[PDB]
Amino acid sequence: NASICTSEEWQGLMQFTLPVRLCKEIELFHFDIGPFENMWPGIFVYMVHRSCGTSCFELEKLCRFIMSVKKNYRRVPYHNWKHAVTVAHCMYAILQNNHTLFTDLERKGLLIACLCHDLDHRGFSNSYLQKFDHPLAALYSTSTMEQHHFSQTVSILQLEGHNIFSTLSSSEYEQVLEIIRKAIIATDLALYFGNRKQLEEMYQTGSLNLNNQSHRDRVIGLMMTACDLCSVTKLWPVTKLTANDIYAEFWAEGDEMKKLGIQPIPMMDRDKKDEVPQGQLGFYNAVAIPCYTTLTQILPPTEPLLKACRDNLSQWEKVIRGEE
Ligand SMILES: CCn1nc(C)c2ccccc2c1=O
Ligand SMILES: [Mg+2]
Ligand SMILES: [Zn+2]
């Protein structure tokens, strides 16, 4: 159905001014939004205006949208409002460093898709919902949550005074929603592996062409994964703290499986905390390093994301060796 923000919430956002010392900070890939909670809605407005312009969206409509988007996130340990803004910030840094490669419609679509990508998340994986016949898995067979997140995105845009894309042409509005839809779906990690493998082959053979739409869609997809997994690109102390949140949500899912007499995978088992550093080595080796390596090849200015991920891989290797 989607929840609406209050008049007080959106009007408070309209008046927000980002402190000048942070304008330079937000441009960095390693930027951590963590210590500026009150500013997160305002940080998103700032990023939208810098990337798309102050004339791109009607200020009141944009403020209503952000605040209603904020309300439609649940108070789960990881897949919350904080994660939405963190993923949107990383997209802003990628877009800013590759400005002319993407259209005005892609830049507005991607930043919106990133803030909306995990809308109404329940703290449960797709496999869990499918295994326990949850109504969301009956409605959406594959990429269960991701289809629900896009359904929630459309629902918020269809609220009163929330359609931030109304001023686009009928063809452009259709285009923007398709951009948002493919971007949200791409955040399903199960789709990433095949997507990155296709991109690798295209890059190595020299057949990758950003003029080709299917290629573009695949590049956008990898950008989505790269933003979604960005906690691995922060400074070590931030990366550790976000892992705690990721695991707290995983262990609660594992607890639900145990209550139903099902042993969860070690990742979702709170009695298997000792296995985490090896699980992180495996995740960096087969997921994060390949992701950021392919991203840096396609978009060389995204190199600092790979550099930070490689530093965090080094820290996890240091944990294993007994140097933590
Ligand atoms: C703690 C870093 N991390 N670690 C793991 C293991 C993971 C597994 C599936 C989806 C996302 C993640 C992830 O972000
Ligand atoms: Mg998700
Ligand atoms: Zn996410």
State whether the Cα torsion 71-73-75-77 is positive or negative.
Answer: negative
Resolution in A: 2.3
Distance of CA 94 to the CA centre of its chain: 13
C-alpha 20/C-alpha 2 separation (Å) is 35
Our answer to whether residue 79 is catalytic in this structure is yes
Nearest alpha carbon, ligand 1 atom 5 = 283
The structure tokens 């994964």 sit at 225
Atom of ligand 1 nearest to the CA of 247: 1
**CA of residue 103 to ligand 3 center, whole Å:** 23
Mark residue 169 as left, alpha or beta (left: phi above 0; alpha: psi -120 to 50; beta: remaining).
beta
Domain CATH number, residue 124? 1.10.1300.10
Report whether residue 246 contacts ligand 1, using a CB cutoff of 6 Å.
yes
C-alpha 12/C-alpha 194 separation (Å) is 43
Does residue 57 contact residue 11 with C-beta atoms inside 8 Å? no
C-alpha 194/C-alpha 199 separation (Å) is 9
Burial group, residue 223, by CB count within 10 angstroms (0-12, 13-18, 19+): buried
- The residue range of the domain holding 170 is 1-324
C-alpha 308/C-alpha 155 separation (Å) is 37
Instruction: Report the residue numbers after which the chain has a gap, meaning the C atom sits over 2.5 angstroms from the next written residue's N, or none.
Output: none
Report whether residue 279 contacts ligand 1, using a CB cutoff of 6 Å.
yes
The structure tokens 């877009």 sit at 95
CB atoms under 10 Å from CB of 25, counted, come to: 14
> Residues 223, 229, 235, CA angle at the centre, nearest 5°?
115
Reduced 3-state DSSP string for the chain: CCCCCCHHHHHHHHCCCCCHHHHHHCCCCCCCCCCCHHHHHHHHHHHHHHHHCCCCCCHHHHHHHHHHHHHCCCCCCCCCHHHHHHHHHHHHHHHHCCHHHCCHHHHHHHHHHHHHCCCCCCCCCHHHHHHCCCHHHHHCCCCHHHHHHHHHHHHHHCCCCCCCCCCCCHHHHHHHHHHHHHHHHHCCHHHHHHHHHHHHHHHHHCCCCCCCHHHHHHHHHHHHHHHHCHHHHCCHHHHHHHHHHHHHHHHHHHHHHHHCCCCCCHHHCHHHHHHHHHHHHHHHHHHHHHHHHHHHHHCHHHHHHHHHHHHHHHHHHHHHHCCC
Does residue 96 contact residue 236 with C-beta atoms inside 8 Å? no
Indicate which residue of 79, 121, 148, 149 is catalytic: 79
The structure tokens 């933590």 sit at 324
* Helix 104-116 with 59-71: angle, nearest 10 deg: 30
The total number of structural domains that make up the chain: 1
Does residue 30 contact residue 308 with C-beta atoms inside 8 Å? yes
Report whether residue 22 contacts ligand 1, using a CB cutoff of 6 Å.
no
Report whether residue 189 contacts ligand 1, using a CB cutoff of 6 Å.
yes
Closest C-alpha to 186, from 159, 164, 218: 218
